[PDB]
Design a protein around this nucleic acid. Structure first.
Ligand SMILES: [Mn+2]
Ligand SMILES: [Mn+2]
Ligand SMILES: [Mn+2]
Ligand SMILES: [Mn+2]
Ligand SMILES: [Mn+2]
Ligand SMILES: [Mn+2]
Ligand SMILES: [Mn+2]
Ligand SMILES: [Mn+2]
Ligand SMILES: [Mn+2]
Ligand SMILES: [Mn+2]
Ligand SMILES: [Mn+2]
Ligand SMILES: [Mn+2]
Ligand SMILES: [Mn+2]
Ligand SMILES: [Mn+2]
Lengths: 99, 97, 106, 82, 99, 87, 94, 105
DNA sequence: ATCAATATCCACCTGCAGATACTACCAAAAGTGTATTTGGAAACTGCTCCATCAAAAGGCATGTTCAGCTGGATTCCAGCTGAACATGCCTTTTGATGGAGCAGTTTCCAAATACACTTTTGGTAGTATCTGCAGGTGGATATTGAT
DNA sequence: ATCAATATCCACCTGCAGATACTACCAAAAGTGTATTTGGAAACTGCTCCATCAAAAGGCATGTTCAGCTGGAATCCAGCTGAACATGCCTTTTGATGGAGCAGTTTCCAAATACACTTTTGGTAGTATCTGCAGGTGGATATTGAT
């Protein structure tokens, strides 16, 4: 039989891998694309410093990682190990980001 | 000895109350709340305008700083209307003398 | 005959006082003439907005006098005022009646 | 292929974010939920950033514009000036 | 034959009662003693304006009420109707009061 | 000339019925037995932090009397702004 | 062309005093600059409010101190107060 | 002529701190002691972080402090973490931490 | 228990991007000295309001009994999500290249500040008198729960 | 559904605390006018750095299969927690008194601002040398999962 890791094993491996490193985890150009599109709805023909986009990605990724931590606690609170939209919503509600 | 004068926005809040609800009064405790509200929003807008002027190396807070500060601080429709009422008041003020 | 800067601006709120508070508050070296006018207008507008909704809340409760509870009801029931005052506590205001659906009997 | 920009924020990239957040198992609906949350965040910050740009009468969003906007939203960021 | 409301009926009546009113729910004098005890442990021979104590009580009650709201959402998230210490802790962690 | 009685254990003046009432206003239907001591602990931390800051304002002003403003300023900087007592 | 001020060379001096054989990347230096600026603003801002609250037009070492107590956690505040008191004493005598 | 920093026994620039204070519109006046005290507090805080971050570099077998080391120092220190609780360090990443219930067996 | 498949770690190596050490140049900034102004500490004290008192009383806390129904444990299984592999698509690199526009410099005037003098006003302060509604009662309607 | 116990509703009323009303007073505020200063807008422009372009290179995202195991549904039951009751204590309320200490007013000098002048420094720009460590290698060995 060809080798195969149990479900959850590789995931735990990835957790250790990414909690060890600091590199950004969203692709640069797709992110740069998203930012410019959103900015366009506020003011037309804008240009961006490269450091401006980088500041945005760092702040945005750090925000999502922290949010995922809270989300994880909410899932575990409900005796699950799987995070659900239910969990993200509860975290954001208690954070005061909504409702 | 005279106790020093304690300023508040009460008589102005009251005026606006009569414009908006001619047959409605307001308790002193509720007036207390309204006074806290005006002072709070005052400090918020003024503080934001202060930072704004400093980020742009300006030594003058003009109506333009106040306006941007209002856009930063207020949400949606509130910003829209506040800006309009502010612009209106300034144009009127300058159109005199 | 002198005209107040408030009447000159067509405002109920005091332009003179707002200009004075701006200078005394150490926000910048200089304060332009349009700044207290604009600010007084914004403050007055916001005051009108809240008093409008609080007056309605009072009326809804068969009262003719606005009390803190009415101010709280008006603020928490308006999505935008709630956002602006999201980190503010209204003394003697209480909370909105709100029972999570799952708590009701069936 | 026709492609929306928020859909450019891919499932595997969202997965890596969750991993750094210490998340072991992810529901299928998470990826769309995340993108929506991402968008609101970016909108809120960029709006304030552009507002600083306009006030300075510029056509270029600077790192400082972003840094100031982040500080407004209580998301103070170190390392990009200020 | 002696009348009894079912468990939960009176609790719901009480929720409606106190969500309708605005009065302070902690007894005044005991709260004042607590304030003086705590302040004394920080600095001796302090005096209090009466409105200062009331300012503290208005803040403390509004804080706890808001905390119980979040706590309630945490218990419901776990498919319970009964709030527990672990709900309070979860809400305070996500709030960033312990994180 | 004379001293006041010793203040101790006053956290228990925050009774179970008082905590139940606060939970009701917060929309809580059912309450575990361990909530009451947990709540007292949480309340004490909140109170200590606000009072510490307030008294710090008091001392800086070289006063012996904690004012409502001291409390309000303390609440403000803790991110718990309070309307109805203040400036 | 104009110049841009930073705390870099002062951060570097302090580094060599605590870890003489340790270097620091430019990215890490950017972070330290953000740190110094942030804490400066926090302390100055709090000192400002203190003066205003007490109807004072002067920010003195006393305001900086109360501000430090309000802003820094226990032990960090203790050492900071001591370091600040020390520097003002040595500045008075020298 | 001896600088105020030398006169105060400080590495941080007192004159600059004083100038930043009065130009920041914090008050009408600034006492001579205030920029000394504030410069001292800032230098001390800088030292504490650089010390802890330096150790973090040592532990990682590096001689050069990078963002990651600053993050490790701050988040592993109870008081520094509290002081900088609402601050994100660019390129800092997070602390290694896995909830127990997620571990196998 | 054995045993094979991968992941992971350690030791060493090398190219280079980023750190460093140097010399020179200069505008701004920090130190020095002097003359002038003034904020706020001291002293004195009027007077608000805080601490403490007593005393009566009923609203409410405490403690117990009782059992309804909630939480927690257990089992079970459909199906969702992780792992792995096969494609192939587009992000990344980097290097050059206009040129947009940030930013530096010069000019200069509308508007700000400083100041002296005149007038208006909002804030007590002292009484004097309405009035909205809290809280009481009573009796009609509604809700809940047993049967 | 019927009914009985109990909460809820609402109209009515009365006491009164708190809101409204007036005059008198006045210190500070606000407004006017003149003179003097200057912030920053405007116009022009050099140089930074941003957008775009090509163009492989391939790393990484996407689609599919299979099944391990997780989430959710169902079932049971011990016992926790809610409801109701009896008891009586301690909070609440009302009013008074002394005096602590907050706060208002005035005198006054140490310290801060304001200039003018001199000197030092930190940011700078080239210019050249140096080095910590990322990234690649191999081989040891730890981990995982099949038996
Ligand atoms: Mn004690
Ligand atoms: Mn004076
Ligand atoms: Mn039973
Ligand atoms: Mn159940
Ligand atoms: Mn051009
Ligand atoms: Mn008047
Ligand atoms: Mn009633
Ligand atoms: Mn000029
Ligand atoms: Mn199966
Ligand atoms: Mn399971
Ligand atoms: Mn008893
Ligand atoms: Mn005395
Ligand atoms: Mn030098
Ligand atoms: Mn390596």
């Amino acid at each position: 039989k060809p080798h195969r890791y149990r479900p959850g094993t590789v995931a735990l491996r990835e957790i250790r891998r990414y909690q060890k490193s600091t590199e950004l985890l969203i692709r640069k150009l797709p992110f740069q694309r998203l930012v410019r599109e959103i900015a366009q709805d506020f003011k037309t023909d804008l240009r961006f410093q490269s450091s401006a986009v980088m500041a945005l990605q760092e702040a945005c990724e750090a925000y999502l990682v922290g949010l995922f931590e809270d989300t994880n606690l909410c899932a575990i609170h409900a005796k699950r190990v799987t995070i659900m939209p239910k969990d993200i919503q509860l975290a954001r509600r208690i954070r005061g980001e909504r409702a | 000895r005279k106790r020093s004068r304690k300023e508040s926005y009460s008589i102005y809040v009251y005026k606006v109350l009569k414009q908006v609800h001619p047959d409605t009064g307001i308790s002193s405790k509720a007036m207390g709340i309204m006074n806290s509200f005006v002072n709070d929003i005052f400090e918020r807008i003024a503080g934001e305008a202060s930072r704004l002027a400093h980020y742009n190396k300006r030594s003058t807070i003009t109506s333009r700083e106040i306006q941007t500060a209002v856009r930063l601080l207020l949400p949606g429709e509130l910003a829209k209307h506040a800006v309009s009422e502010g612009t209106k008041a300034v144009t009127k003020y300058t159109s005199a003398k | 005959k002198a005209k107040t800067r408030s009447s000159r601006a067509g405002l109920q709120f005091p332009v003179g006082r707002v200009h004075r508070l701006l200078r005394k508050g150490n926000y910048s070296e200089r304060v332009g003439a349009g700044a207290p006018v604009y600010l007084a207008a914004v403050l007055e507008y916001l005051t009108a907005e809240i008093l409008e909704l609080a007056g309605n809340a009072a009326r809804d409760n068969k009262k003719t006098r606005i009390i803190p509870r009415h101010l709280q009801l008006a603020i928490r029931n308006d999505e935008e005022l709630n956002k602006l005052l999201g980190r503010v506590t209204i003394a003697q205001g209480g909370v909105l009646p709100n029972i999570q659906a799952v708590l009701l009997p069936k | 292929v026709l492609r929306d920009n928020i859909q450019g924020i891919t499932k595997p990239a969202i997965r890596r974010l969750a991993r750094r957040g210490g998340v072991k198992r992810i529901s299928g609906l998470i990826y769309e939920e995340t993108r929506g949350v991402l968008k609101v965040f970016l909108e809120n910050v960029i709006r304030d950033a552009v507002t600083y740009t306009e006030h300075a009468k510029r056509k270029t969003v600077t790192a400082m514009d972003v840094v100031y906007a982040l500080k407004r939203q209580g998301r103070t960021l170190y390392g990009f000036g200020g």
